[PDB]
Amino acid sequence: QCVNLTTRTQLPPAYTNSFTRGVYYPDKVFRSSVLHSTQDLFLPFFSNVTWFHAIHKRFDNPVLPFNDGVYFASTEKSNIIRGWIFGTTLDSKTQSLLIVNNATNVVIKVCEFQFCNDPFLGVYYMESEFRVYSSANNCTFEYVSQPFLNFKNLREFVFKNIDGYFKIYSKHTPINLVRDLPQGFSALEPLVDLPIGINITRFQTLLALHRSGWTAGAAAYYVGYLQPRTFLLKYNENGTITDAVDCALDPLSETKCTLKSFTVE
């Protein structure tokens, strides 16, 4: 079942500032009271992240590139965001990954789905509408897991795909800010690793409609891209990352990165 929605109000997407968001633990090594230097795929400081809305009428669900990895943030209340679609052609020709969070459980499936042009779900005022795929023939991987999940919640995710391993890092934050991303520091702990071994170059997000035509709940999300660079991370005595320095932002940061210190004489 595929349903095309034609009540959208045309408007370009917004842009906003990253601040110092998108830092994750690069490995599983405990370190205490250390300044460590790591080179990896990170979100550069003060970068321009794309802002997509869902307000009423706005219903933003376009096909986006994946590049070398994706930072996904969602400022959320009342649980509109649900999951993601990953793959290269997003049809039955090749193998695609589907991560869904319905009202009960989190379902990860690697199959050859036939995806509709506008996949979505529906909430009745209870969930009784699920129009994402029409068929799914060859399933190589299945995984049922625990649920991951003014705006009140901030959900941050990092998705990577290296040597056939899909890595997902996640973090949840209680905020009280309305429109833009809050400014601060938080490290993203590893959430899951899947040995799917498939190519990914495009991805979709999944939203839930509100029927009482149709209405989209007030939601907003931001997308940023990862690039290879060197960071200087600060591990405190309990082994938590509490600060970072981007060694390519400006000359003072490069001085700090060469001196391996957060203070310079």
Next chain:
Amino acid sequence: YRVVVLSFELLHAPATVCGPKKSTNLVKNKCVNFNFNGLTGTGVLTESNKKFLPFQQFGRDIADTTDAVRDPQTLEILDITPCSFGGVSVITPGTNTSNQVAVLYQDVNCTEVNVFQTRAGCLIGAE
């Protein structure tokens, strides 16, 4: 006759299905060889006070040498200490005077070798 044939495909995808892993018993306070999930070494394993985060497995020091580990069977933290080593020196007067000697084991406790415990090591053969 009932016949079942098993075929194994090994492709560029990550390995997924294969045999179990046989674990031994865990012994502490002794110089042993050890293997923890493929991390191999030699040393003495003792009880620790460090508290890892639930996703962490290893522990490194400033010079990037492993010094703590988590037991995969029971999620407990163990410290790793190198096995004792040192120099052995002979204290003698001249052979023109006597043939008596004393021996110094450097940086070694006296219980692991007229036994006198100095800060320089363990001295045997001297009063």
Next chain:
Amino acid sequence: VVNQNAQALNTLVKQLSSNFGAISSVLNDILSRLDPPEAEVQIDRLITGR
């Protein structure tokens, strides 16, 4: 004086995890994964670097 001595000693300890053009910087891994005829060449590279 203290800082220079500590820094030199740290550099010496850190140089021990470089492979110097071999396959690995761990002697045990090379010994357990390759045979003596070629582990000999790899080990010789490690020895000259160290």
Next chain:
Amino acid sequence: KGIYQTSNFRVQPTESIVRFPNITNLCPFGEVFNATRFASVYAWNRKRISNCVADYSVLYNSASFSTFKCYGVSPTKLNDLCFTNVYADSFVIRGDEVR
């Protein structure tokens, strides 16, 4: 008269230790070998095995199997070689045609 450094003292390891996580989610071989019914020769049944750990020692040591044969791998070395996936094709034939 003096003190001379003559030797080096080194303590030697006593035992050897190997530790690994608990064995869980074993591959369901009993779903194939102990099936209530089987398939014909021309329409043999295929099953995929992945995302589990498989123990062939219990399968090998059973005395209920008349023929257990293969050439490219020695059966005692099947507990460590680690593969992408396993295919199981089952059927029923004549006793003479097993060869």
